[model samples]
Target: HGIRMTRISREMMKELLSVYFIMGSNNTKADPVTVVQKALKGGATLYQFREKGGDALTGEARIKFAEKAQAACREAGVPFIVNDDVELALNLKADGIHIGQANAKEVRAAIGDMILGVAAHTMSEVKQAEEDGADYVGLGPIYPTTRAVQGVSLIEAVRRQGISIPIVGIGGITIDNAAPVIQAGADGVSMISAISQAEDPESAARKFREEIQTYKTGR
Candidate 1:
């Protein structure tokens, strides 16, 4: 008897980023590849490569860095996603691409069937994203963090309104607060400082995984 192959679907995508870790060279004290490798070892379910601003790599340099990140994710069996850079994402053959409101449509059109994530702040935005065909929606900053403000209500609101796409709560999320986000109906949590800024990226990432898993199991 032949074993059947299971196609990767939205369910898989949700699992991919249940403990999502986003990072850039500028965000970490360690080398980008080293940081990613360590985070993966620590059980990060997905990796998003987000290079930006003064530290952003351009041209071949950016591609090189993306390749290293992709390689690290590949070795760890985690999906690697590019943040807000469609062209670079295409060039690097990333498993998926994450975009904000401004580029969601264009990027989705450009990368058909590839995993696409959109950042949404309200129920209206979440409905629009679902209509626009996003594979997942990132909601945040759930707390008073630099990125945005109070997203736990947003997640609960979306769920109450019947929005079903995979949801990942981002911003100001730390191990201590991650469970609340999950309890509010988020399928996952996305973090930068909580993981990248920690003295031990691996351990921090592991703790997040533990928190999320424990909450989910208990619920």
Candidate 2:
């Protein structure tokens, strides 16, 4: 079999980051392509198209959106991962799929030879993700977040339970609070506002990379 997973060192992964290019139909200024291109220019290694409008549309419109975004992702040379849509991911020949506890199994099954990631909210869910064949698990809500308020205790509990898979801790992960999560045992930390809404996404991303480095070296 091909390598079960890509071997990524903590140091190397500092450059491998993802951005969710979210937008609503109300604002043309906040186009998903613009957000995605900006993040890619800022050194993001992966992109997730999280727009909600496409799901409400049908046929030609949906296909058009998917094609445009997929083209953008390919041009960037970064993997495109579709959030919560296994069939779409497979159909689009995306780099991978990101699933939460609800569709972890389906995503895993649909992934076949492709990379797979799962958002794990609890120790049980994390274990289930591992069992279901996720290449990595996102252990999240490590800090307070408006986007995901699922509570941070679950990540800590997973750390205590001793997670062995590559785990990315997300949700409200700022440079100040991210160190603790790293110490608690996460392969990496993922954030949105820390990069997307920052005064400078590139500068902010560099800071996070540095902090994770400091945390790794200190250990």
Candidate 3:
């Protein structure tokens, strides 16, 4: 009974992990916790803490920030994911850890059984991530950006190749384009600038939720 319930819970996590929202205060004027709360209120299913270099928080300060983020996510019933910082995720007991191709294997070994997400751009990388035991693969720069733009096709290719793990389309996703990304075979879309840079982050997130749901229902 316990095992069955655990499987059901994990499936729910996978589904909810679709409307993934990643944020950091590095480029924004708003407080991290405040932004997260707004995004949650707007219907973000999962949140990723992505504090990075230069102007970002560090060490004890970063950990403290992550704790606050985790608390907000918990209060909202959203899974908290730590991006590229397995140590911080483990210390915070985050619901998941997301890493790029360079560290997928290492992170997977370090955090067993936790929801592990790996960034993959190619069919080879996607298969490698699955072999590395990634819970999901983040494929993107789907739309035009400084990053490459092979998101939609990549999701199609991964599906054609028979990789059954959940996939989230990242990079350049917005309320306008998120539906197309989902239609391209991705389980969900991950956004950064769209929600964070909006005048009303909550409204942006709600619009995204509506678009994704609308597509799911119609399809």
Candidate 4:
């Protein structure tokens, strides 16, 4: 196991899904670490440091950003997930790695019981993720984000398949739109601009958690 103690179990993984907060240097103008620190205070259950967008930090700078955010997540007792970069994720001993069509044959072993989340948009991809031994699957662009709207199809379809692993929804999610994602049977919800750029990161996260836990779709 990548971890010296106990790997995160399925039950805990499901619980951790309440609010999966992801951020990077480009996501907000504020320091990513401080932004996460504030969001953690607001009860962000999990965090992913995805260094993204044009001109994002790289090399040693990227490492420092990740380390700082990891430190914040550690202090908050939340899992720190890394997106796209397996090398950095392992280097920082992040709680897990989130991927887009990653090499499961190698990464599955490389992670060694650490969380593995697959970004899957279709049922076939979802099956492939499970075959790859993914701990969970993240689906999205679910709401709107300058792309064709997907709504909750990916998440709802996966649940209808009786999928055993957890599922998460993302993309253009706001407090108003968040309820449908959770009501669709997603194990958790993730967002970027909503919390990272919100005036009060702590309150933003708190409202998001409330949207996830308390709202009903009335379907």
Candidate 4, which segments miss by more than 4 Å at Cα?
1-7, 146-148, 215-219
- Per-candidate Cα RMSD to the true structure, in Å, reads 3.3, 4.4, 2.7, 2.4
Global Cα lDDT for candidate 2: 0.63
Candidate 3's C-alpha runs over 4 A off are 1-10
| Candidate 2 weakest lDDT stretch, 10 residues | 18-27
Candidate 4: C-alpha lDDT: 0.83
Tens digits of per-residue lDDT for model 2 on 28-128?
33554555565566655666655454434456676567667778667877667676777787788877777765566666666775767788776787898
Query: Clashes in each model (backbone N, CA, C under 3 Å)?
Result: 1, 0, 0, 0
Question: Each prediction's Cα lDDT score?
Answer: 0.83, 0.63, 0.81, 0.83
Per-residue C-alpha lDDT of model 3 across residues 1-219, encoded as one tens digit per residue:
111212224356557756799988784677778888899999998899999987999888988888998899988988888999888878878888888855677887787667888888888888898888788888987987444787599988887887677889988888877887877777788998788878898998898888887776664
lDDT order, best first, reads 1, 4, 3, 2
lDDT value, residue 112 of candidate 3:
68
Winner by TM-score between candidate 3 and candidate 2: 3
lDDT of 1 by residue, 65-169 (tens): 889999998899888889988888777778788988665777778876678899998788888888887889999888765455975999898888876689999
Candidate 3 scores a C-alpha RMSD against the true structure in Å of: 2.7
Across residues 67-178, which tens digit of lDDT does each residue of candidate 4 receive? Answer: 9999998888888899978888888888899988658647878877788888888889889888888888888879775445688987888888898678888788887888
